[PDB]
Symmetry: C3
Subunit: 443 residues, 3 copies
């Protein structure tokens, strides 16, 4: 029964704050911060109070609590049709933890034996089919997209599986599923209690994939180290296995999670590096990768490439593909001198934290050699219990593609300045039609 | 199980693409076309995938299929309260076909015996009451509106009927009904499953009209070639008549369909013709109509006026009053090298087809003497099974009003360039407040 | 069965007219007026016809009818969770009248014995804690906010009550409640039939306040002229008392009603008065208040300050904090030469009436010495049966704060022109971040 955060007073147009959030979210949240003179503050959306933790020193309040107190279940009901009932966020809180952890186990550094070669293998194959000429023009964003999905499938899926479901069909399933979503319904929980037609189409689409996975398992058992096999070998505390229904859901979530995020990180990283005023940084990277043979390996990429890590990390720092991390308060919580009541939605913003000037002096500058001036202010992958569990995989895959690509080609951007981000989409990246790039096959 | 069309990635603001569609729909769909490099493509609206057939060579894919495969029922649930249950699109697919065809029968060239005189009669009466002076100022769009409703009622309704329900009351019923609609709910099928208050008001409004029609029928049977009479004489395959409930619905649909479309076509046609840089075309039309007596007839208007037809047709070509034709895919369908999955909404756009530069070189120019450079690219009235069944009537009425009006008055537009279209409305026409025109009674 | 008002034709974007109403509502409604050439007219919002009475000569049509004919119940279902079921607008029409009247009784001039001293007392205390220096910078809008809530609580609540619930907790309850609202759902009655989570949080919040009130009553009865006591002494026609549930609801409605309105009136009044080109008016006010002692009283403020009244009234005239008064037509009603059908929403607009140039010549000028050129055109507090019942209290409190403040400090605005209104909010006032003001403690 203490002090509530200050409240931006309710506005009339229905969900109108989302339109501002989709146009310039940074200025928007910065105004909120200035006007009410508080890093912690509250806006109302569709009659849903949303409290934004906008002070980087307070990050621990947000990321520390357990799922029974700050819960993501209620904020991600949109996903239940694409992932499936009883799966991840639509799963009881214990079963949910074990599930997320099983997937995390499958993506530990300890599991990446063949990955870097499988990945180099795919990138080379891709560059050979589409970058055939001595020079040519491409959309970098679309091509990274292709590479990420193709590389992920080589790593994670066995030969038998890929033969039944290639990456291009997989990419279509993921796209169809995305397109069926209503992101703004995060603020319309009443909508999601109603029958949606496209909820049912997507469950049929996911039952087709489940069928495939089942046929494969039966085949394997006639004649189990890929993701599918790993997950089927998993055991809960009570000594039971995951259903194939749960496994199919986890695999979809895994690929869905990485489709846009990894893609966008690669694109930005490349875009900054090929930019003239960053020549200096491009040379620094050439030195680092020239120092290696051609066929790379785990150690090279993960252990022996600290400057690549910086470039990638700084790209996420400048343009976090996920603008906002959110939770449903199931029991009230302190934050600075305030309390945040149960039922509120509580939110923390990588975009905002990453442009705080105490935290990142001259935030608009991309500088791979900078460091946070506030500890924990970088939250591109979050922090705490809920920190990204595909971070190490995401980074392997991005670092490898960088290293393979820049070794074999020069890249020229076909406009003066680096692309504007497009804040209209769920996952934020560079504007598609500003991503035109001319490759040049190297001597 | 083939290739899906490329998908514009989902955006956050709720139904935000509609706001762009209501501001500059042409640029919007053109961007979609450029960015994804495909004439066929997909956007998501309110979680509803909408596939746009944007390549004029593919028109046959869209317009060929039968109602059991590409259905308009689900896209036009908005209309069920104004037309009535069991009527047109709210009717089982067989009964629906017969109904639409009965109405089509009543509007065949074979049925237009007295129409041109009845129409001249009304236009003269109108010009005498409101264009009394030697010169004066008017809103062309409002006055065409009046003329279209008055002329339609003379043609279609008998004396007894019109005495009980004049055109000005009829125009009010149509307006009240329109105003009760939620066009954007095409993308909110969940909304239309909920009780709407204004659904019930409109059914009471339509029961008042039904009562009137019934009283008239009883009167006629004491003392049947108008639309009301024709339709009551109709027989289904199974040998039964339409209910009066179905007939009342058909009559409303008929008048509703033409209220704005015909009006807008007339207005544009006049606006282009009275424009100075089109003098040449105005003279061409004067020659064509001077060549006739004063009391016109069917042959004169429909058979002996090919240049009027061109001017009208080109006006629809430049500014199709219906931007978009849509269907619900009930079973998947090929389109070019793509397949379009069941549950998608499939759409084809006269606005887009009519501004394709292969199809209509310099699309922005109004030129009555042009021709399509792609066969079937003109779709102002659609094509195939679902082609407009009031096309011949619409055109009779527009051609006649042109011929009667320009014979008796000169017209001057009170601003430099022709009016901008206003894309905000369901039916698109010229901006109301740019439609100021000065008439001058001729010598 | 007469003439309907003309209808602005339906637009596509969902509730898109609200976005225009939240950007420039005056231009919006003025366009509607010009374009259709009628003071009375109709727009459609979310499929809900809304008829605007925009001609000041017709005000009596709107404000005369009884609650059984023009009802506010259906337009204010948004408030039912914050005020409570069975209370005010969620109450049967007889019980509703008696309730509103009981509250009106408690705010008659006859009840304001200690009020002016209690109020001076609070304003002095406030100026001493926050305006401590010889000079300093403040947000006038936030500080009036504080003063209004603190002064209201001194007047209306006894010592025992205030000790259990101070104004700062009270202000938080009011804010939390506001933030839970969906103003645009005035046009989505279907939404309010669905379970909203934040409906339930707010009822728990109001049950906590009810508990407090009950504990206090029990305490008082051990050891009844404040608002709480007055209302508990009230008797309905049938000889029963209000429940404590109804009393708690009335008290919340009372404080909610005044939080923003009174605040905004004070702010504007001060902002205009401290503006240089209004020096003349500032001096006129100084003369009026210098003519009094320091400890003021009822007569001084209400009877002996006619120029303060003018300044306040003109501020409401220029910027009515409530843009629009609305009602649900339960039975059709004449308005000028039109009829307005049952089910329509009928609306009248202080913003519009207050900027009609026949009514207020040069409406954009703030002039405390003007007069209406149309009788009844000023409707800042409405008119007729539903006229504001906190008007006399609102004005006491504003006049007093003006008189106490300007006596003790000079005020300087920190930008050239007076703040723009911000039309985005439910209650409209000056833009927060343009309200920076420098006080100077007087000699
Ligand atoms: O891309 C999104 N989600 C998808 C689907 C998803 C959700 N949760 C997951 C957990 C694990 C795996 C996948 C998911 C996703 O891939 N998220 C994701 C999460 C973690 N790592 C990688 C990717 C996504 C992207 C944006 C988004 N919002 C748009 C902005 N917004 C918002 C929030 C607060 C505000 F104050 C505001 F004005 C707008 C609502 C949240 C909501 C979303 F669900
Ligand atoms: O005027 C409209 N309909 C009305 C009512 C109606 C519907 N179907 C009928 C069949 C027969 C008779 C009447 C009707 C109408 O009069 N339509 C019409 C149809 C055929 N001939 C003449 C007039 C209308 C006008 C526009 C509209 N849309 C607005 C734009 N929109 C849209 C569509 C696709 C997109 F990708 C997008 F971004 C927006 C949704 C469709 C929807 C509509 F129903
Ligand atoms: O502040 C508002 N209400 C609140 C809550 C409330 C409602 N009724 C009451 C009766 C007694 C006490 C409180 C209330 C309020 O405090 N109103 C109020 C009423 C009377 N005296 C002082 C204050 C409020 C403020 C604005 C509003 N609208 C936004 C603009 N709008 C609108 C209306 C017509 C249009 F044509 C349009 F385009 C938009 C919908 C009405 C609706 C609202 F309820
Ligand atoms: C550049 C790529 C990626 C970025 C930027 C990113 C970002 C994030 C962020 C910000 C969070 C929220 C963490 C928190 O709440 O503390 C997160 C969580 C998560 N990410 Fe990612 N992510 C990426 C890739 C992936 C990949 C490839 C996967 C593959 C499975 C994945 C799965 C997850 C999961 C499962 C969670 C949260 C689960 C939980 O609630 O514990 N992410 N990610
Ligand atoms: C200039 C006037 C008009 C224009 C521009 C217009 C345009 C169109 C268009 C584009 C279609 C879609 C056809 C398709 O899907 O292939 C259509 C269908 C239709 N129009 Fe019109 N129309 C006009 C006037 C009228 C009139 C006066 C009526 C009177 C009844 C009418 C009734 C219909 C009907 C019933 C359909 C489609 C029925 C079906 O699904 O088969 N229209 N019209
Ligand atoms: C400057 C301050 C205020 C302004 C500008 C304002 C304005 C208005 C307006 C425009 C109306 C509509 C009246 C009608 O429909 O004829 C009204 C009604 C009302 N106001 Fe206020 N008001 C103010 C302060 C207050 C206060 C302090 C209260 C405290 C209780 C209050 C309670 C009400 C109530 C209960 C109604 C209408 C009840 C009914 O339907 O009869 N208002 N006010």
């Amino acid at each position: 029964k203490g002090k509530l955060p200050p409240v931006y007073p309710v506005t009339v147009p229905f969900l109108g704050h989302i339109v501002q959030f989709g146009k310039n979210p940074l200025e928007f949240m910065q105004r909120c911060k200035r006007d009410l003179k508080s890093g912690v503050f509250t806006i109302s959306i569709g009659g849903q109070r949303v409290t934004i933790v906008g002070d980087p020193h307070e990050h621990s309040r947000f990321f520390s609590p357990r799922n029974e107190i700050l819960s993501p279940r209620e904020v991600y009901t949109i996903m239940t049709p694409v992932f499936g009932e009883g799966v991840a966020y639509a799963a009881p809180y214990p079963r949910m933890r074990e599930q997320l952890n099983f997937l995390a186990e499958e993506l530990t550094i300890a599991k990446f034996q063949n990955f870097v070669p499988a990945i180099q293998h795919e990138v080379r194959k891709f560059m050979a089919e589409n970058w055939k000429e001595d020079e040519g023009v491409i959309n970098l964003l679309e091509d990274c997209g292709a590479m990420i999905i193709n590389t992920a499938c080589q790593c994670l899926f066995g030969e038998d599986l890929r033969k039944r479901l290639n990456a291009r069909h997989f990419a279509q399933l993921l796209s169809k599923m995305e397109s069926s979503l209503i992101p703004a319904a995060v603020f319309m929980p009443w909508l999601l209690r109603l029958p949606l037609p496209q909820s049912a189409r997507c469950r049929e689409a996911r039952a087709e994939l489940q069928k495939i996975l089942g046929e494969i398992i039966v085949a394997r058992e006639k004649e189990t180290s890929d993701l599918l096999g790993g997950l089927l070998k998993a055991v809960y505390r009570d000594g039971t296995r995951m259903s194939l229904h749960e496994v199919c859901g986890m695999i979809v979530a895994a690929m869905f999670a990485g489709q846009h995020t990894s893609t966008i990180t690669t694109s930005w990283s490349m875009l900054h590096l090929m930019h003239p005023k960053n020549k200096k940084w491009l040379d620094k990277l050439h030195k680092e990768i020239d120092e290696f043979p051609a066929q790379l390996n785990y150690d090279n990429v993960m252990d022996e490439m600290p400057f690549a890590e910086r470039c990638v990390r700084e790209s996420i720092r400048r343009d976090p593909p996920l603008l906002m991390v959110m939770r449903m308060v199931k029991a009230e919580v302190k934050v600075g001198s305030y309390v945040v009541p149960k039922g509120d939605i509580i939110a923390c913003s990588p975009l905002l934290s990453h442009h705080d000037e105490e935290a990142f002096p001259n935030p608009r500058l991309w500088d791979p050699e900078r460091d946070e001036k506030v500890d924990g202010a970088f939250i591109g992958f979050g922090a705490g219990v809920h920190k990204c569990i595909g971070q190490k995989f995401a980074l392997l895959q991005v670092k490898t593609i960088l290293a393979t690509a820049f070794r074999e080609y020069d890249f020229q951007l076909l406009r003066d300045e680096v692309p504007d981000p497009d804040y209209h989409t769920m996952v934020v990246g560079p504007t598609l039609n500003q991503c035109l790039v001319k490759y040049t096959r190297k001597k």
